[model samples]
Target: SLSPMPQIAGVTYYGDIPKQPKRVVSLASTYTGYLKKLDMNLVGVTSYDKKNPILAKTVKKAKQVAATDLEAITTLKPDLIVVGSTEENIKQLAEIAPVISIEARKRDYLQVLSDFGRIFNKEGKAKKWLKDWKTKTAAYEKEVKAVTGDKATFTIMGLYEKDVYLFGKDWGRGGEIIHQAFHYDAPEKVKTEVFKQGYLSLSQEVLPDYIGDYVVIAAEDDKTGSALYESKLWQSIPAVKKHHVIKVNANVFYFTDPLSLEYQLETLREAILSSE
Candidate 1:
């Protein structure tokens, strides 16, 4: 019988977990940074992880795999495997090695890191990192708050193929840093609607209602977003007229992972400070 594993994200695991795991495969792209920070022997990661500038260099040597690629993962002979709670093939993955599924979408960044520390038996490292991160963000919060008055509300929007999406604190696009760390308020409708659903897709006509005093547009590419910016509807917004729009690369702002979050925090500080 395999030894019991500590529940992760409230999910219990009965699969075998190595006392000192050497080779690890992370099917969940968001947790790859935490595994790297905890100094795990990361052998494989999700393909999307390579898109992150801060993580790309660190994970360059690791093989990139799809979250559902069981064949490729088995080839690596991993001692432990990490997956998201919603991963479809948990039972199949468990056959290869101990699998722990985390609810990456629901939990806050700090809590996710703490869970990883426990999974890898590196709680002290996690604590140290969190402490250091808190210290820096505290300073950044003051710096940003100084420029953006406490009364100014913020909105994070994403431009996609055909629709624009409003994001909440947990769904990346600097939402966590803006709404939670910096204690910035969202537009009233955003707080009432988007926060409950994480994100709400809206037409260009009603976009003004959800926008705040300062707006963050996470545009997929320069061309499509530029089109939106040049529109009469976008031009009519008060924040846009005042040049309060901060445009960030959608790919860069997509992940709430540790490396991405740290990069985003700085990006936000500079953007908010520079905005009129």
Candidate 2:
């Protein structure tokens, strides 16, 4: 029940894929959700996977493996090891088992899922998931558009410890849901300057130029972006005047994977509709 996995571009590896590996060890927690969805026999996963609320229930049953802990990984006797493209110990991991180093950050969630499907010989599952996703997103778009109309522009902004940032379509924090899936427009400055690079950090003074009709603020806690929310400048923005600014938990909106995206689509739909 094994087929040769064709070499993938932009991915580097040291050993041959065990052709339908049974005991797969995933060091890249980003793809852990996908593998679990595909029903792979995951033997080990990183602590990051265990920490993700969306993945916690499933990953808790798997052993936690650190990327650099070779001896511990070797004990797992994995047939394949999944790692990030830039992992420093890829060679060492390859020595233990076949290594597949992926560019988890460079590609979007859909691209990564498609690639995973091809690699794992689970194309049918991936295709079905994407089909359902399209249907769900279409329904979400129609519902959200009803509340704000088609012309409402949106922005996915984040308030960090010391900086403010704008995220474009591909980046997480509901950018994919607000801009990519809903086809909502953003400020011209955001389209020109922030879209290509994923995000752009700015001082509070320049935020006025990037403000949109619906401003989504991603903050870890109340205190993180409180200054911006309470500022005289923020109060003066047109979106603020209309009471269209909405806040989201930074952690919940930080991922664009299928599981996270589904949760975000529902949350964003409720948030945007209730704001009206």
Candidate 3:
């Protein structure tokens, strides 16, 4: 409602924002991180995985990421709707209100935040998060570089009921930071089977082939994960024997947004430095 329009991700919105959007709905989990940092008013969200550490914290002030029932969304009476590209039924949502669609790409995490800042007119706060994150996690980068250089072998993974997923830079779920940010080295077999092909869904038996000097596991199925941790096979892995295995919350680690990335960096450093 002024000099120019807010633009983002190859799309442009030519005036249609509230002076202070009374009600807002965040359908994308990553965007919720940005909105939280800016202290933006949020009425609802769409990512309802209670196991998410970051999302847990976010939902404390907001509701569990709610369903996309237009009746539900409209009932909230939202002034704006921020949705992710991966989310379904976009055309249906646009009919509700001014819809801003964005993707959750780790490489473009900050870029999306910046665009949101412009759209919401919180550039100052957005830039502040960037600066604070750099100051806080900047030291961890060197720490990670040292540990990784010492071993040159680390991998990010997820453990479900009986399935294992080897993470790479293909997705945001900590893969971006481990492979793209820190550029940690993975096992040769892991590089070919998982990294090159994107996460491999294999059994625990083949996990040893992918084991690295350090391993981060987002254990969604903790029940099975607990049993797997005690199995003889799990102990044989190099990282496991070295006590370099760190269990993390899959939901939180699944995001590489402004909030989660820095939090995860520090957590990763703690895992490497913690002993006993």
Candidate 4:
């Protein structure tokens, strides 16, 4: 028999919402960004900035007010409030209502899926989603292997004003996920440091040293930012000469959550498979 939808707070939820609920409020950057991308019908999102105006526009009824603005929240009275465990204001939000904390910045996607699934009672749906993701990943991995074989060495790096940040296995960014999903091999030193720090900050002079057979640069289009990769020093790298250097949108790849992984995977596949 089909069970009646569960009620949270005073509102009755009918059927399972795509990413969680009827009236959902997100209070963290990464997760909120994910929700904005995956479910534009999000009821509300807390703490907005210029970087996420799309989210603001998407959740028209949602507010960008501070988490401590409980009076405002009380008036709106969301059914479920989703916050990030990494946010410093989590304790404060908890006092306002039934708040669910999701660790969006963590390394494991499966754990994230499970957390939201448990919160929304969508365990079965989560399992099916995971299976689909695994299948897609496997197909992509096979494609990667067929194209590059064992000859490819991949690196994903973020460019800053003074230094470049190398992403490793534990970063949970799209780069790290793609590497893990494809079973790409990291250099011994990279593998060692990856387990310890997960990412490393390096000066631009040493950029060539870290260059792999395939290098993906997540560059922001800000002044004194990742755009520096286009300079002569960066252009001189062996990977660049081989046309193996791919510049990707940093915001979507690094800042956004797992929901954007599909797009990232497609970008990677195009970069690797299209070839010179």
Candidate 5:
């Protein structure tokens, strides 16, 4: 078990000691999911998904926030609170507990995992887990490379009501793992766009215009209804025609979690290897 973190600014952050620490809170649903996977107790999780009652049970309380729920959070009297740099309420939550804001933007999976492990003082455990992860991933990568053989171009896109957002290597969501960590080559045009730090944001009605040789569509479940798949424009794309388009589970791919990279790599491998 990791030792307790040294006091910072008069606040003692929870460490990886075997004994359960006092109240710990995670302000984001995605972070709550990852922390739960680590078997950590959380004071509360902010989620609006009533369907996932399991998430509600893990935490002492679950609440949705219109504004900063500082009073409710303070009532928990948590020793530590985890927040994401990209979260909307980070600034407000900082007033309650010593909020540790993780960089939620584009970052390599190994770096993110190692950083999280360090923060919780679980470097040893994290190292072991990563070693095992790499062993499995390396074998899968070899199989994928043999089958695809530098012939595939991979891209990920998020579908919104009005427009589709193309992801690049720097996007927090699985872009870095797909394009850089996995070493999959993207089309020259897409590569150039990414080089320019330009995300191809296009109207949903014109999604086919941006479809690549291998495209992965990721969208919030609520937004990806059957109607969208039934569109003529969606079926007309070359990738869709050749059955190269994969619909990845948005929850696993778009969220930053302990298994995010693992899941993303496995999904990509499965898609490419099976396509051949």
Candidate 6:
């Protein structure tokens, strides 16, 4: 059961992996969904705030951010401590128990699942999920393409106070998947600069040239929601006038994980068909 030197993605795991790790500790909440997919319950999680709707569902029973200390983590006695970054105080965790860090810096989410499959030695389960995920994504692509055609361009925008900005893969939230579902490209400037820089600030004058054929304004807070709604610049965009702008929840849209993808896909499908 103890398989040492089990390589995952780019990281070399230098500890023994048991046949089954009943009590697992997660340093980040991002991968808990994937671990749960393998029917592995989390015994501890880091971002365990009452405000996090997602975390409430998974680690409600586990103590919040309880994995940061040696004494606290020792009580839970996790079989493996999972972290997104290797530089994350691995030395401290290793002193108590085995630490396995995943490369969350990578953008390819599918590969993240694949990496988990190898680490857990659940290749069969992983393959099945990927196959199912592929089929679902392709089907959604076909449906969205029926509405927007093949050559259309789309972009995601967010408003903070009076300022508007284009988001790339990270803060762009669901932009990557939305673009994939519709087979649309972001503006070249967006791909080259905005995505690379994390986000791009914009003024009213330059927005027209940069916005895509369609716009999906990320769901915003009350302040921004009202500000963007009342702004003349926001209303005057061609997509706004043409009624091509759709809005989605920022929280769910911000995730690319397996658990969140279903909600995002369903919500997006409904909007695209119903969007004017």
RMSD of each: 2.1, 2.5, 3.3, 6.0, 5.0, 3.2
Per-residue accuracy of model 3 over 1-276 as CA lDDT, tens digit each: 431345455433423656456667877765777767667777877554345676557656555545457788877777777776766777777677666666544335556667767766888988887777656655665676665564467777887667777876655557766665566678888788776666777787888888867788886556858777899998888788878887887767877666677777777777766733
Give candidate 6's error at residue 247 in angstroms: 2.0
Q: What C-alpha lDDT values do all the predictions have?
A: 0.82, 0.82, 0.69, 0.61, 0.62, 0.69
Number of backbone collisions per candidate: 0, 0, 1, 0, 0, 0
Q: Once model 1 is optimally superposed onto the true structure by TM-score, how far is the C-alpha of residue 240 displaced, in angstroms?
A: 1.0
TM-score of 5: 0.75
Model 4 C-alpha RMSD to native: 6.0
Estimate, for each residue in 170-236, the C-alpha lDDT of model 4 and write its tens digit. 4644555556678787555556655467689887787677766877777655654545656899778
Worst 10 residues of 6 by lDDT: 47-56
Residue lDDT tens for model 2, 137-176: 8888998998998988898899889889999997778898
Model 5: weakest 10-residue lDDT segment is 9-18
lDDT of 1: 0.82
Error of 2 at 207 (Å): 1.7
Show the lowest summed lDDT stretch of 10 residues, model 4.
8-17
> How high is the lDDT of residue 249 in model 6?
63
TM-score of each: 0.93, 0.87, 0.82, 0.76, 0.75, 0.83
Indicate the residue-level lDDT of 56 in model 3. Answer: 59
